């Protein structure tokens, strides 16, 4: 548990360096894309238990963790029934569906609010 | 037969290619050298012992 806690610093260091690159200079994203590719390669080989919302904002198409917020498209629509948020990055032209709805708030708290509540030392 | 559509493939050509080096030439593919080292042995069989060949390239004009 200690050696994995060591590599946690390296992984979120690469994650913070990607945010430093994307907050430093706009429209030239090669450093942050390479850092997110290295961060995904570490999680692909040394496979761990990562956080569900951050990793789904990493946009696993190629690599874009902060890019689809202020540069690429994240909007809402209603396709068939419940309304869906569409997340599309302008690099590999892939899409992400995420339904957001008030009747299912407990299922929005079913993976997330438990780990905040059941956290014991 | 499908391979023989291109080359000649004589009746004893498969027997030769089973244990002799067959190299393509001006006409068909024929035996250049034996697989086993017998350069002195071919002469020793040529002087006193028995030795044979395969001569099928000789085309024939029959005139009547």
């Amino acid at each position: 548990p200690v050696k994995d806690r060591e590599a946690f610093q390296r992984l979120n260091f690469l994650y913070q360096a990607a945010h430093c690159v994307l907050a430093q200079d706009p429209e030239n994203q090669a450093l942050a894309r390479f850092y997110c590719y290295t961060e995904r390669t570490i999680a692909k080989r040394l496979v761990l238990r990562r956080d569900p919302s951050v990793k789904r904002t990493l946009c696993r198409g190629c690599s874009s963790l902060l890019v689809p917020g202020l540069t690429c498209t994240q909007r809402q629509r209603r396709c068939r029934g419940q309304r869906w948020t569409v997340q599309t990055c302008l690099t590999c032209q892939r899409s992400q569906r995420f339904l957001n709805d008030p009747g299912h708030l407990l299922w929005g708290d079913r993976p997330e609010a438990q780990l905040g509540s059941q956290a014991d030392s | 037969n499908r391979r023989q559509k291109k080359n000649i493939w004589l009746e004893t050509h498969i027997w030769h290619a089973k244990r002799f080096h067959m190299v393509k030439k001006w006409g068909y593919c024929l035996g250049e050298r034996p697989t086993v080292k017998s350069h002195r042995a071919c002469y020793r069989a040529m002087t006193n012992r028995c030795l044979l060949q395969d001569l099928s390239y000789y085309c024939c004009l029959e005139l009547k």
Binding site: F8, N12, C20, D51, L70, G108 | -
Partner: protein, 182 residues
């Protein structure tokens, strides 16, 4: 004892301070400045039988995001609809370049309720580039408390990381879900 460590990193981006009185009177000022001009916009849209329509009132999440993407000086009003509001308004938090994302937690539905319109607007913004709507609203814009986001760089050369290694227990989810397979 099945306990696995998980690298969870929600570096908590807390909202603006809960200044009840200041927000409470500036929102009433906004209601006064909206009711002081008139209702030609709904009469031009619904056509119950054009100058007030020229505002670009971005209503809905997608219109506010397409207003906040390109390059636009404007004001956004955000309310918390349900508990999943961080994912939707994370765009509004992240798009701080040249706009003001004012967020009111209890009060923005009570803004849409007396104003003659339709169903309760969750995210609102207005594009009013170079046209004079109300100068007092543009005086209120640098008076609201601004939000500082230390998630990216926070505009100052200073970086701080935090270590949040959560122990996920199998027993907790086991007793909450109560499922077995053989």
């Amino acid at each position: 004892l099945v306990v696995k460590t998980s690298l969870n990193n929600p570096y908590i981006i807390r909202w603006s301070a809960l200044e009840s009185e200041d927000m409470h009177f500036i929102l009433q000022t906004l209601e006064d400045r909206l009711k002081a001009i008139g209702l030609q916009k709904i009469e031009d849209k619904k056509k119950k039988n054009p100058a007030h329509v020229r505002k670009q009132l971005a209503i809905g999440v997608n219109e506010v995001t397409r207003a906040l993407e390109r390059r636009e000086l404007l004001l956004v009003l955000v309310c918390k609809s349900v508990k999943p509001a961080m994912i939707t308004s994370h765009l509004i938090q992240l798009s701080l370049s040249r706009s003001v994302p004012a967020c009111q937690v209890p009060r923005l539905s009570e803004r849409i309720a007396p104003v003659i319109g339709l169903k309760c607007v969750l995210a609102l913004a207005f594009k009013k580039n170079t046209t004079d709507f109300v100068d007092e609203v543009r005086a209120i814009i640098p008076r609201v408390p601004s939000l500082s986001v230390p998630w990216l760089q926070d505009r100052i050369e200073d970086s701080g990381e935090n270590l949040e290694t959560e122990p996920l227990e199998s027993q907790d989810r086991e007793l909450l879900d109560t499922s077995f397979e053989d």
